[PDB]
Design a protein around this ligand. Structure first.
Ligand SMILES: Cc1ccc(-c2cc3c(N[C@@H](Cc4cccc(F)c4)P(=O)(O)O)ncnc3s2)cc1Cl
Ligand SMILES: Cc1ccc(-c2cc3c(N[C@@H](Cc4cccc(F)c4)P(=O)(O)O)ncnc3s2)cc1Cl
Ligand SMILES: Cc1ccc(-c2cc3c(N[C@@H](Cc4cccc(F)c4)P(=O)(O)O)ncnc3s2)cc1Cl
Ligand SMILES: Cc1ccc(-c2cc3c(N[C@@H](Cc4cccc(F)c4)P(=O)(O)O)ncnc3s2)cc1Cl
Lengths: 336, 336
């Protein structure tokens, strides 16, 4: 689906850039914007953008899929990638990250620094420029502008909650209710709801009820994805994933610590109070081994089965009238 | 006009905040957003927001001005103030500023720091939340969403140009063409075009030609405003303005340095190369006195008269069919 549509998606990028990087004296700014687009919108897996394109094909009767409709699908997928890029560039400055996608974070490059704040705003702005240029005449134009704006806001407000929740190792902040709330707003809305919802609108499916039904399935898939992402940060083999995890060094509200704290005798709370959020490795070793000693690998395994049963019921209940394959194709990318 | 409508404008702010700061577990984020709104959207002169409200009154036949139309005018004015706030919070982090509006910049507050990057994005997002909540049923809704998005982009792309132009004292970058380009994109579009254009749309005046005509007048007024702003940074009495200027310490592309560089013998270029962008005061004294020694106070005075003659011709030529008072009220705020 994705294996076999990733090709035209990445080749489209070059057109995306052409049309955004066309008024003599603004030239130098426009060159900078090109360098920003190139460094930051390229080099991920493109799962979110591609989901737009795949879902567009599944949703539109194939006799309403001319060259220009496809091109709008490619474009809106690239909009989702640009929203991703905006959030990351800015999040990397906020967290003080060193690398991203296997390279030096844009803000850490020589003579970029905090100028990356403007660069990131430009990435966001490019979303609406593309939507104007390619979709202004379409009946779903407004629908999409609102979708992207709301996705930004949800993701922003989730970032606030995350930042309040994890500055300083106060583990009383790290609750289940709070973990779930952070994942929904910061991650799931834009990563899972947004791309399918966009394809929906592009197909004419604008009903509030249809969107709510898809949302219900897709926010739940997003919660599982992040939960598996947190497991793997620590237990994932690093040559299968790519990441090597610093969740624990960074005092993250990770599903692991949440579960751990649900399960600990008061003596264990202490070992964790003493090791959570530390630089030193031995004190990260002894967090791992405390998680191992509470069979969190196994709780996760149980959680993962339960979750899969749940998603399948959701799809059975709430997919109609969309093709269950829209959702199943996504479920297969994450439950693998 | 403004003297006599500032009152209901600032009192509206409290309602703006109520409706943005209403889903249990997101509460703590919402409290933070309230603190962000309160610190950053309050304490300026409100010229831009108020311009919305004043121009709305002049433009709408007074028999289409019910309680709810007025409330939408107050709201859209507050949107312009929020856009202002978004840019400033972010610009203060980028420039490493210490104070703003007579207080500690938000990002310099204890335990805010770079979290202010998200805070600023939230301010931007609030613009579209308000536009949804108060204007979604209006026929000019889309018009306004596009206006605000384009204003953001223009201002962002201007900020890029400014940052490229002034990192390092390379005065070869500081040209007239480049000064004007920076002012138009970074300042004039949002400060002058945006608020009148918004009032226009709210009144039903959506024509491209009417907008182009108003734009022509208003971008020119914005160029004068900033030019006078740069003069005053240095020659303004600091107890009449409020600001005391660091334009020269900061290596700014100020209209002053532009003119100076147009006027200097090669020996003078050197005195300036040696004093521009310095901390030390004596080396800022001797920039002032070099500007004084080239009668820049007087070139400015000439420039200011020329400019006023020009704006009046523009208004004569391009105001119709809007009431010339829309423009004159603004001209009186800046040529005073
Ligand atoms: C809609 C959507 C949004 C994001 C993704 C992502 C999957 C993914 C990812 N998936 C791996 C497995 C995986 C990693 C982390 C969480 C998870 F649920 C699944 P893979 O496909 O590389 O085996 N790895 C690293 N980053 C990402 S981002 C996938 C989808 Cl289908
Ligand atoms: C929509 C969909 C979702 C999940 C699957 C499968 C996932 C999977 C699988 N996934 C994980 C293990 C797993 C364990 C327990 C329940 C579960 F759903 C999945 P992984 O091997 O990536 O660690 N392992 C072995 N066979 C299968 S089949 C297949 C489909 Cl078509
Ligand atoms: C549409 C619009 C947008 C911004 C302004 C501003 C005027 C202004 C300002 N004006 C002073 C004078 C002045 C200062 C700097 C430049 C200029 F053109 C005029 P004042 O009204 O306080 O005497 N001073 C400090 N900040 C600002 S912001 C005014 C208007 Cl009318
Ligand atoms: C639309 C309009 C624009 C400007 C004015 C005036 C400005 C002004 C004025 N402004 C400046 C001086 C000035 C000097 C030369 C030309 C010019 F237009 C303005 P300031 O005293 O703020 O330094 N000074 C004395 N009288 C006036 S009358 C009055 C109106 Cl109604």
């Amino acid at each position: 689906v994705y294996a076999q549509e990733k090709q035209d998606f990445v080749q489209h990028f070059s057109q995306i850039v052409r049309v955004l990087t066309e008024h003599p004296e603004i030239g130098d700014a426009i060159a900078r914007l090109k360098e920003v687009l190139e460094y930051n919108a390229i080099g991920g897996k493109y799962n979110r953008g591609l989901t737009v394109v795949v879902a567009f094909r599944e949703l539109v009767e194939p006799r309403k899929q001319d060259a220009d409709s496809l091109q709008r699908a490619w474009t809106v997928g690239w909009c989702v990638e640009l929203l991703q890029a905006f959030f990351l560039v800015a999040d990397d400055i906020m967290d003080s990250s060193l690398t991203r996608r296997g390279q030096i974070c844009w803000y850490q490059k020589p003579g970029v620094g905090l100028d990356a704040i403007n660069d990131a705003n430009l990435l966001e702005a490019c979303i609406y420029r593309l939507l104007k240029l390619y979709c202004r005449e379409q009946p779903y134009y407004l629908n999409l502008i609102e979708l992207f704006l709301q996705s930004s806001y949800q993701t922003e407000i989730g970032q606030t909650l995350d930042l309040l929740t994890a500055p300083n190792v106060d583990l009383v902040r790290f609750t289940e209710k709070r973990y779930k709330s952070i994942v929904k707003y910061k991650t799931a809305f834009y990563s899972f709801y947004l791309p399918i919802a966009a394809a929906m609108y592009m197909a004419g499916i604008d009903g509030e009820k249809e969107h709510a039904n898809a949302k219900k399935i897709l926010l739940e898939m997003g919660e599982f994805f992040q939960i598996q992402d947190d497991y793997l940060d620590l237990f994932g083999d690093p040559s299968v994933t790519g990441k090597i995890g610093t969740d624990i060094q960074d005092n993250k509200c990770s599903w692991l610590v949440v579960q751990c704290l649900q399960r600990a005798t008061p003596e264990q709370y202490q070992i964790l109070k003493e090791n959570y959020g530390q630089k030193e490795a031995e004190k990260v070793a002894r967090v791992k081994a405390l998680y191992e000693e509470l069979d969190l690998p196994a709780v996760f395994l149980q959680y993962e089965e339960d979750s899969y049963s749940h998603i399948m019921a959701l799809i059975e209940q709430y997919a109609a009238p969309l093709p269950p394959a829209v959702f199943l194709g996504l479920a297969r990318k994450i439950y693998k």
